[PDB]
Amino acid sequence: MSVYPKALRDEYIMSKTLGGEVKLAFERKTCKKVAIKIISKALNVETEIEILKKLNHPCIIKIKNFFDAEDYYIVLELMEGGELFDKVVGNKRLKEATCKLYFYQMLLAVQYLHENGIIHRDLKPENVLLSSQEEDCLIKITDFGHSKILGETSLMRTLCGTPTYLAPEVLVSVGTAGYNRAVDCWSLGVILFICLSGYPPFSEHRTQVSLKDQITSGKYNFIPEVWAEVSEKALDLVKKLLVVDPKARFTTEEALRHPWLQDEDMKRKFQDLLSEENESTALPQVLAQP
Amino acid sequence: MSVYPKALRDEYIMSKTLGGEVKLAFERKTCKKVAIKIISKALNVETEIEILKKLNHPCIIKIKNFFDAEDYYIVLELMEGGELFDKVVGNKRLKEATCKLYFYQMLLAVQYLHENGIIHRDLKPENVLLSSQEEDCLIKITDFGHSKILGETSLMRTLCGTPTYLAPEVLVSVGTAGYNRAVDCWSLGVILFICLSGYPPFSEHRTQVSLKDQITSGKYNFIPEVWAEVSEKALDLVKKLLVVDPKARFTTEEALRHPWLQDEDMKRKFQDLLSEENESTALPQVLAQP
Numbered sequence: 001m002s003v004y005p006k007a008l009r010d011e012y013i014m015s016k017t018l019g020g021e022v023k024l025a026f027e028r029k030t031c032k033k034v035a036i037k038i039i040s041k042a043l044n045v046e047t048e049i050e051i052l053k054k055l056n057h058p059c060i061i062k063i064k065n066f067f068d069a070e071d072y073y074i075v076l077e078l079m080e081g082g083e084l085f086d087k088v089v090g091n092k093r094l095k096e097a098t099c100k101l102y103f104y105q106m107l108l109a110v111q112y113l114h115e116n117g118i119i120h121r122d123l124k125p126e127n128v129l130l131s132s133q134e135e136d137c138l139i140k141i142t143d144f145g146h147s148k149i150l151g152e153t154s155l156m157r158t159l160c161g162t163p164t165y166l167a168p169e170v171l172v173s174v175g176t177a178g179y180n181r182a183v184d185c186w187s188l189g190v191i192l193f194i195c196l197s198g199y200p201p202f203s204e205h206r207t208q209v210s211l212k213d214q215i216t217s218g219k220y221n222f223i224p225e226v227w228a229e230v231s232e233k234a235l236d237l238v239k240k241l242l243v244v245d246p247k248a249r250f251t252t253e254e255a256l257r258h259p260w261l262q263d264e265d266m267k268r269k270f271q272d273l274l275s276e277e278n279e280s281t282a283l284p285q286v287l288a289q290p
Numbered sequence: 291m292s293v294y295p296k297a298l299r300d301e302y303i304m305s306k307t308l309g310g311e312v313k314l315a316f317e318r319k320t321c322k323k324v325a326i327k328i329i330s331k332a333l334n335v336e337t338e339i340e341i342l343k344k345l346n347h348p349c350i351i352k353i354k355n356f357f358d359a360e361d362y363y364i365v366l367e368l369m370e371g372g373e374l375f376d377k378v379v380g381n382k383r384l385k386e387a388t389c390k391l392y393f394y395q396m397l398l399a400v401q402y403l404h405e406n407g408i409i410h411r412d413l414k415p416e417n418v419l420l421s422s423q424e425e426d427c428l429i430k431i432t433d434f435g436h437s438k439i440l441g442e443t444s445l446m447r448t449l450c451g452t453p454t455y456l457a458p459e460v461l462v463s464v465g466t467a468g469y470n471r472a473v474d475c476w477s478l479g480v481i482l483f484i485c486l487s488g489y490p491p492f493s494e495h496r497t498q499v500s501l502k503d504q505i506t507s508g509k510y511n512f513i514p515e516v517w518a519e520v521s522e523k524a525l526d527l528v529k530k531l532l533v534v535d536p537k538a539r540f541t542t543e544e545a546l547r548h549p550w551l552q553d554e555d556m557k558r559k560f561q562d563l564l565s566e567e568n569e570s571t572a573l574p575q576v577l578a579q580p
């Protein structure tokens with residue numbers, strides 16, 4: 001077989017494989033469970049860690065440690081409920097209220113990413129982790145391997161000069177520049193569609209039109225019998241995220257302002273899950289005195 | 291004022307400014323002239339040097355040395371005829387035969403770049419250097435600061451998976467992927483237009499239509515009185531490079547196969563300029579013996 005590097009074994013007791021490969025481990029210092037992501041041997045790994053260290057949001061996975069050996073070892077927090085994929089696999093569908101609670105968190109997470117100049121680019125049910133086995137739980141976005149950092153573009157520098165020698169396709173690209181983040185909103189629309197209905201909107205199963213053609217036209221597979229169980233507001237949101245034009249597509253802010261997300265009961269349940277997890281971390285408070 | 295770093299002064303005697311800032315210097319070891327490009331203080335500089343060290347073509351400038359101090363110092367070969375810009379500034383126009391000789395070299399240089407996965411992205415008369423004050427001379431492409439290296443794209447990796455969650459604009463982008471190099475061919479068409487005519491094809495002078503609009507429509511300013519002096523073959527080539535669609539636009543290979551470049555006299559003059567410059571470098575030959 002092979003062995004774990006000495007530096008890792010020093011701080012962690014390695015255990016069972018959880019699914020790159022992810023292993024269960026125990027931090028020796030605390031006796032607490034962690035998840036260790038093993039990445040076989042680089043440029044994406046450098047960016048991934050850098051992104052993970054900068055982010056601080058309750059709906060985004062946190063990096064605990066990192067080891068650079070024969071393979072890369074990213075120590076992450078352990079999520080007991082596993083992937084959202086396992087709750088939707090086959091034709092399993094979540095209760096609409098459960099969809100809302102998880103979707104709201106996904107929007108807050110993606111909104112936080114976009115506010116911080118990060119595009120995930122790989123949002124899918126297998127990259128959404130649940131904090132517990134209970135259906136009302138906190139969710140965390142993970143797997144920042146395909147992610148991209150937004151900064152000052154070469155296009156922005158190109159536009160500071162005279163376009164005497166500049167090609168027309170560069171000038172045509174100015175119309176869409178800065179809409180890259182809209183790929184996350186499309187992905188969010190696909191996750192929401194799956195969660196609400198139990199089936200994917202674009203599939204090669206029981207159809208002639210190519211997957212490519214179903215996507216570029218945005219003609220999702222609508223099954224009325226399945227969707228009758230779902231509210232009009234929920235479907236209206238899916239429809240606004242599954243828009244072909246990335247400039248007309250709903251952003252995370254527009255999705256958060258949508259009537260389907262104006263649910264104080266869902267919001268209170270989320271605030272209740274937050275404070276319950278924070279209860280262990282919470283240091284005493286400097287309180288005002290009259 | 292300021293001073294040059296000790297490591298540079300050790301090998302070079304710094305002299306007059308030639309124009310970032312470029313200074314004339316003398317290599318102490320050989321007593322030969324060099325040009326030293328001073329870049330004030332990074333990511334483009336790293337890529338520029340890396341590109342320059344890899345390239346070996348007679349129509350591309352060579353890096354001789356590099357110093358990483360308070361500012362970056364790139365030691366390059368000295369070109370005695372200066373920039374092609376100075377031969378075309380105002381309404382100065384080169385003889386058609388001189389255009390051909392210089393253009394042919396620019397095509398060989400750009401073809402070599404494209405074959406080696408490099409896109410220049412900043413081709414213009416000020417980035418073309420002449421080897422001598424004589425009109426029949428060797429030309430060198432310079433200023434690789436805006437250049438881009440072509441490798442395995444994120445798109446190529448994205449297409450290896452199922453597009454269930456993939457946004458339509460990513461799939462739409464597949465049509466044009468890999469045509470980035472065509473920006474150099476557009477720039478070459480603009481340089482050729484200027485060289486042949488003495489005036490730019492797109493200008494804000496004496497017109498109402500915006501520079502952007504003249505470029506995206508590809509409606510260049512054609513002055514028949516100026517172009518009557520020029521051959522139909524030369525204009526036909528300009529027309530094939532100044533094509534709006536980057537997929538229909540002439541590539542360097544198509545431009546090299548164009549009837550205007552099928553001139554053995556021009557080719558012989560280029561081969562004659564090559565061997566004359568190589569004469570000093572030429573080590574003795576291992577010759578066959580019957």
Ligand SMILES: CC(=O)N1CCC(C(=O)Nc2ccc(C)cn2)CC1
Nearest residue numbers: 018022035076077078079080081082
């Ligand atoms: C069956 C079980 O005991 N599970 C379900 C799966 C779960 C799991 O892989 N979490 C996980 C995976 C990756 C990351 C980064 C975090 N957390 C552990 C508990």
Ligand SMILES: CC(=O)N1CCC(C(=O)Nc2ccc(C)cn2)CC1
Nearest residue numbers: 308312325366367368369370371372
């Ligand atoms: C007037 C004169 O003596 N010139 C014309 C200008 C010329 C010149 O700047 N070359 C140059 C500039 C940059 C680089 C990289 C190489 N080479 C030196 C000779």
Ligand SMILES: [Cl-]
Nearest residue numbers: 002003004014
């Ligand atoms: Cl081991």
Ligand SMILES: [Cl-]
Nearest residue numbers: 292293294304
């Ligand atoms: Cl000095």
